[PDB]
Short mmCIF file of C-alpha atoms and ligand atoms in Angstrom, two decimals:
data_model
loop_
_atom_site.label_atom_id
_atom_site.label_comp_id
_atom_site.label_asym_id
_atom_site.label_seq_id
_atom_site.Cartn_x
_atom_site.Cartn_y
_atom_site.Cartn_z
CA UNK A 2 115.23 86.36 43.56
CA UNK A 3 113.18 89.19 42.12
CA UNK A 4 112.35 89.82 38.49
CA UNK A 5 110.37 93.04 37.97
CA UNK A 6 108.01 93.47 35.01
CA UNK A 7 107.17 96.97 36.34
CA UNK A 8 109.26 99.30 38.62
CA UNK A 9 106.70 99.48 41.47
CA UNK A 10 107.29 95.74 42.02
CA UNK A 11 110.47 96.49 43.96
CA UNK A 12 108.51 98.67 46.43
CA UNK A 13 106.98 95.38 47.63
CA UNK A 14 110.23 94.10 49.18
CA UNK A 15 112.92 95.47 51.55
CA UNK A 16 116.20 96.29 49.77
CA UNK A 17 118.36 93.18 49.28
CA UNK A 18 115.32 90.92 49.85
CA UNK A 19 115.89 87.45 48.43
CA UNK A 20 113.94 84.19 48.29
CA UNK A 21 115.88 81.66 50.36
CA UNK A 22 115.33 78.00 51.24
CA UNK A 23 114.27 77.38 54.82
CA UNK A 24 114.18 73.57 54.76
CA UNK A 25 114.43 70.59 52.42
CA UNK A 26 113.98 66.81 52.41
CA UNK A 27 110.22 66.95 51.63
CA UNK A 28 108.35 65.26 48.75
CA UNK A 29 105.56 67.75 47.90
CA UNK A 30 105.02 70.69 50.23
CA UNK A 31 101.59 72.35 50.25
CA UNK A 32 98.91 74.15 52.27
CA UNK A 33 100.83 76.65 54.41
CA UNK A 34 99.14 78.93 56.96
CA UNK A 35 100.66 81.12 59.67
CA UNK A 36 99.13 80.61 63.13
CA UNK A 37 99.91 83.66 65.31
CA UNK A 38 99.00 81.90 68.59
CA UNK A 39 101.67 79.28 67.87
CA UNK A 40 104.14 81.75 66.27
CA UNK A 41 104.58 79.22 63.47
CA UNK A 42 103.60 78.39 59.90
CA UNK A 43 101.94 74.97 59.55
CA UNK A 44 102.32 73.24 56.18
CA UNK A 45 101.73 69.80 54.71
CA UNK A 46 103.90 67.37 52.85
CA UNK A 47 101.00 65.81 50.91
CA UNK A 48 103.04 62.93 49.50
CA UNK A 49 104.56 61.94 52.88
CA UNK A 50 101.30 61.91 54.94
CA UNK A 51 102.59 64.48 57.45
CA UNK A 52 102.49 68.13 58.38
CA UNK A 53 105.28 70.31 59.69
CA UNK A 54 105.70 73.51 61.70
CA UNK A 55 108.19 76.31 60.97
CA UNK A 56 108.52 78.58 64.02
CA UNK A 57 109.33 82.28 63.95
CA UNK A 58 112.60 81.50 65.76
CA UNK A 59 113.59 79.44 62.70
CA UNK A 60 112.98 75.85 63.77
CA UNK A 61 111.44 73.01 61.76
CA UNK A 62 109.37 70.62 63.85
CA UNK A 63 107.11 67.64 63.00
CA UNK A 64 103.47 68.55 63.42
CA UNK A 65 101.27 65.55 62.56
CA UNK A 66 102.00 61.96 61.57
CA UNK A 67 100.07 60.51 60.02
CA UNK A 68 98.17 63.60 58.91
CA UNK A 69 95.85 61.50 56.71
CA UNK A 70 97.26 63.47 53.78
CA UNK A 71 96.19 66.94 54.94
CA UNK A 72 96.69 69.44 52.15
CA UNK A 73 95.48 73.07 52.38
CA UNK A 74 95.10 75.01 55.65
CA UNK A 75 93.57 78.24 56.96
CA UNK A 76 92.29 79.69 60.21
CA UNK A 77 88.61 80.16 61.00
CA UNK A 78 87.21 83.34 62.61
CA UNK A 79 88.29 82.11 66.06
CA UNK A 80 91.82 81.36 64.89
CA UNK A 81 91.33 77.58 64.96
CA UNK A 82 93.45 75.59 62.51
CA UNK A 83 91.39 74.34 59.58
CA UNK A 84 92.65 71.52 57.37
CA UNK A 85 91.59 69.97 54.07
CA UNK A 86 92.04 66.18 54.36
CA UNK A 87 92.70 63.98 51.29
CA UNK A 88 92.75 60.78 53.33
CA UNK A 89 89.62 61.43 55.37
CA UNK A 90 87.94 63.31 52.48
CA UNK A 91 86.74 66.05 54.80
CA UNK A 92 87.30 69.51 56.20
CA UNK A 93 88.46 69.35 59.80
CA UNK A 94 89.29 71.66 62.69
CA UNK A 95 91.90 71.70 65.45
CA UNK A 96 91.27 74.01 68.42
CA UNK A 97 94.61 73.69 70.21
CA UNK A 98 98.15 72.38 69.54
CA UNK A 99 98.13 68.59 69.97
CA UNK A 100 94.31 68.67 70.18
CA UNK A 101 91.91 66.20 68.57
CA UNK A 102 90.73 66.85 64.99
CA UNK A 103 87.03 67.52 64.50
CA UNK A 104 85.20 66.91 61.21
CA UNK A 105 83.31 70.05 60.13
CA UNK A 106 82.35 68.96 56.61
CA UNK A 107 82.45 65.28 55.53
CA UNK A 108 79.51 64.77 53.16
CA UNK A 109 77.11 66.55 50.84
CA UNK A 110 73.52 65.32 50.43
CA UNK A 111 74.30 61.73 51.37
CA UNK A 112 77.50 61.56 49.33
CA UNK A 113 81.17 61.54 50.31
CA UNK A 114 83.23 64.58 49.39
CA UNK A 115 85.95 64.04 46.78
CA UNK A 116 89.06 65.25 48.61
CA UNK A 117 89.24 68.86 49.86
CA UNK A 118 92.33 70.58 48.48
CA UNK A 119 92.47 74.19 49.72
CA UNK A 120 90.38 76.35 52.02
CA UNK A 121 89.96 80.01 52.95
CA UNK A 122 87.98 82.21 55.34
CA UNK A 123 85.28 84.55 54.03
CA UNK A 124 84.52 87.96 55.62
CA UNK A 125 81.17 86.63 56.85
CA UNK A 126 83.00 83.79 58.66
CA UNK A 127 82.20 81.12 56.09
CA UNK A 128 84.83 78.55 55.16
CA UNK A 129 85.17 78.00 51.41
CA UNK A 130 86.94 74.91 50.11
CA UNK A 131 87.81 73.36 46.75
CA UNK A 132 86.94 69.71 46.23
CA UNK A 133 88.85 68.38 43.21
CA UNK A 134 89.70 64.68 42.99
CA UNK A 135 93.52 64.62 43.42
CA UNK A 136 93.24 63.19 46.93
CA UNK A 137 91.41 60.06 45.74
CA UNK A 138 92.92 59.85 42.20
CA UNK A 139 96.59 59.74 43.23
CA UNK A 140 97.50 56.92 45.65
CA UNK A 141 100.61 58.88 46.72
CA UNK A 142 98.33 61.72 47.87
CA UNK A 143 95.70 59.88 49.89
CA UNK A 144 94.12 56.60 50.88
CA UNK A 145 92.33 56.05 47.55
CA UNK A 146 88.53 55.94 47.26
CA UNK A 147 86.05 56.60 44.49
CA UNK A 148 84.15 59.71 43.48
CA UNK A 149 80.54 59.91 44.68
CA UNK A 150 79.67 63.52 43.80
CA UNK A 151 78.60 64.65 40.24
CA UNK A 152 81.58 67.00 39.87
CA UNK A 153 84.50 68.86 41.45
CA UNK A 154 83.06 71.81 43.31
CA UNK A 155 83.83 74.76 45.57
CA UNK A 156 81.91 74.45 48.83
CA UNK A 157 80.77 77.03 51.34
CA UNK A 158 80.56 76.00 54.97
CA UNK A 159 78.41 78.62 56.71
CA UNK A 160 79.34 79.56 60.29
CA UNK A 161 76.01 78.03 61.45
CA UNK A 162 76.94 74.63 59.95
CA UNK A 163 75.08 74.88 56.59
CA UNK A 164 77.06 73.31 53.71
CA UNK A 165 76.46 74.31 50.06
CA UNK A 166 78.21 73.98 46.68
CA UNK A 167 77.74 77.30 44.88
CA UNK A 168 80.55 76.78 42.31
CA UNK A 169 79.98 73.85 39.97
CA UNK A 170 81.31 75.09 36.63
CA UNK A 171 85.01 74.44 37.29
CA UNK A 172 87.09 71.51 35.96
CA UNK A 173 89.59 71.02 38.83
CA UNK A 174 89.06 73.92 41.27
CA UNK A 175 92.15 74.25 43.45
CA UNK A 176 93.39 77.52 45.04
CA UNK A 177 90.90 80.00 46.45
CA UNK A 178 91.35 83.57 47.61
CA UNK A 179 88.96 86.36 48.56
CA UNK A 180 89.44 89.89 47.26
CA UNK A 181 88.92 93.17 49.15
CA UNK A 182 85.56 93.49 47.34
CA UNK A 183 84.49 90.19 48.97
CA UNK A 184 84.40 88.49 45.61
CA UNK A 185 86.32 85.24 45.05
CA UNK A 186 89.20 84.01 42.88
CA UNK A 187 89.40 80.29 41.97
CA UNK A 188 92.39 78.65 40.30
CA UNK A 189 91.50 75.75 38.05
CA UNK A 190 94.26 73.18 37.42
CA UNK A 191 92.27 71.46 34.65
CA UNK A 192 91.43 74.73 32.91
CA UNK A 193 94.93 76.05 33.77
CA UNK A 194 93.58 79.50 34.59
CA UNK A 195 92.43 81.58 37.56
CA UNK A 196 88.75 82.51 37.56
CA UNK A 197 86.71 85.30 39.12
CA UNK A 198 83.27 85.04 40.79
CA UNK A 199 81.00 87.64 42.30
CA UNK A 200 79.26 86.58 45.48
CA UNK A 201 75.66 87.75 45.36
CA UNK A 202 75.60 87.50 49.17
CA UNK A 203 75.14 84.34 51.23
CA UNK A 204 76.57 81.47 49.22
CA UNK A 205 75.33 82.38 45.74
CA UNK A 206 77.85 83.08 42.99
CA UNK A 207 78.07 84.36 39.41
CA UNK A 208 81.01 83.48 37.16
CA UNK A 209 82.77 86.62 35.84
CA UNK A 210 85.41 84.97 33.62
CA UNK A 211 89.14 84.18 33.52
CA UNK A 212 91.11 86.64 35.61
CA UNK A 213 94.60 85.57 34.48
CA UNK A 214 96.83 82.67 33.49
CA UNK A 215 100.54 82.15 34.29
CA UNK A 216 103.56 80.73 32.43
CA UNK A 217 105.51 78.57 32.96
CA UNK A 218 103.32 76.07 34.83
CA UNK A 219 99.99 76.87 36.44
CA UNK A 220 98.45 78.51 39.50
CA UNK A 221 97.73 76.04 42.28
CA UNK A 222 97.54 78.04 45.53
CA UNK A 223 97.15 81.80 45.63
CA UNK A 224 96.80 84.66 48.10
CA UNK A 225 95.79 88.34 48.08
CA UNK A 226 97.65 91.00 50.10
CA UNK A 227 96.25 93.91 52.15
CA UNK A 228 96.30 96.16 49.06
CA UNK A 229 94.45 93.72 46.84
CA UNK A 230 97.48 92.53 44.84
CA UNK A 231 97.37 88.89 43.75
CA UNK A 232 100.23 86.61 44.82
CA UNK A 233 99.89 83.52 42.62
CA UNK A 234 101.84 80.24 42.49
CA UNK A 235 103.45 79.19 39.18
CA UNK A 236 106.08 76.89 37.62
CA UNK A 237 108.92 79.34 38.33
CA UNK A 238 107.76 80.90 41.61
CA UNK A 239 105.16 83.43 42.68
CA UNK A 240 103.69 85.97 40.24
CA UNK A 241 102.48 89.21 41.75
CA UNK A 242 99.62 90.82 39.92
CA UNK A 243 97.64 94.00 40.07
CA UNK A 244 94.00 93.62 41.23
CA UNK A 245 93.00 93.57 37.55
CA UNK A 246 95.41 90.69 36.82
CA UNK A 247 98.44 92.43 35.31
CA UNK A 248 101.94 91.22 36.17
CA UNK A 249 104.12 93.38 38.36
CA UNK A 250 106.86 90.79 38.68
CA UNK A 251 107.88 87.43 40.06
CA UNK A 252 109.67 85.88 43.03
CA UNK A 253 111.70 83.08 41.43
CA UNK A 254 112.11 79.61 42.91
CA UNK A 255 114.33 76.84 41.43
CA UNK A 256 111.38 74.38 41.36
CA UNK A 257 107.61 74.82 41.04
CA UNK A 258 105.81 76.57 43.92
CA UNK A 259 102.46 74.98 44.84
CA UNK A 260 101.23 77.42 47.46
CA UNK A 261 102.17 80.34 49.76
CA UNK A 262 101.06 82.43 52.74
CA UNK A 263 101.86 85.69 54.47
CA UNK A 264 103.07 85.43 58.07
CA UNK A 265 106.02 85.77 60.42
CA UNK A 266 106.37 87.94 63.54
CA UNK A 267 105.37 91.10 61.61
CA UNK A 268 102.91 89.38 59.20
CA UNK A 269 105.20 90.44 56.29
CA UNK A 270 107.05 87.24 55.46
CA UNK A 271 105.94 85.28 52.42
CA UNK A 272 106.34 81.54 52.89
CA UNK A 273 106.36 79.30 49.82
CA UNK A 274 105.87 75.57 49.42
CA UNK A 275 108.38 74.82 46.64
CA UNK A 276 108.03 71.10 45.82
CA UNK A 277 110.75 69.31 47.82
CA UNK A 278 111.59 72.46 49.82
CA UNK A 279 110.10 75.23 51.96
CA UNK A 280 111.12 78.85 51.18
CA UNK A 281 110.50 82.44 52.28
CA UNK A 282 111.18 86.03 51.27
CA UNK A 283 110.73 89.25 53.29
CA UNK A 284 108.14 91.65 51.88
CA UNK A 285 106.75 95.06 52.87
CA UNK A 286 103.11 93.84 52.83
CA UNK A 287 100.62 91.78 54.87
CA UNK A 288 97.95 89.29 53.79
CA UNK A 289 94.40 90.54 53.37
CA UNK A 290 92.37 90.32 56.60
CA UNK A 291 88.62 90.56 57.34
MG1 MG B 1 96.26 73.05 45.96
#
């Protein structure tokens, strides 16, 4: 259900729009992305080592088992499915349904990655991913392992194959979302705040400061819509913020929401990974595209 902090919040949803559960029986849902070619949202259950598909015709189907504790997902420029893998400690790509998984980033300067958590596509085609240590710290969320890197970074995987780590000042970087300006937002689940960086072109960043915090809980995954509004996970649902970080309202969920994505047959459905369940609400807006 909807709780407006400002009137214009209601403009964002069709009349009588309500958050509703789509599916249950999961342990910890995460990492949803809509794949138009498959007419389905793919999402992970991180704590059950599997991924699922929710089709536009309203069917839940198993996607991958084991998934090697895949977590976050996005599409690359070509619309290939991109996964963050806790278990394999890598970023990986799937070209086609049922197709083999290809590693696209599995080490940095002779060191293993920690455990990629979330990923997003940059306007220049680069794939940016957060590398906190949840995937190797929590045995329920991966295959174990020890940290090899100096810290928990945000990586940029250039379309040509060049891997860099331009963001090294975060505690546990987690959710990532680009803004219409082409600058980047980074949620930090150690800092418990969402942070803003300017991208000085081509994989070089400058920290701008804390963009916002949320209560109750904290922002894990987040997305930005076509108008630049920020759709941010929290303890009680999704908080919708102005581009400057001011709260318009919230979509309330009975448990914590970890992540979210725009999709559906019109691109206007907001899917939410809500702990043990998977939820959606109809909106009047689409995800940002570039
Ligand atoms: Mg996450």
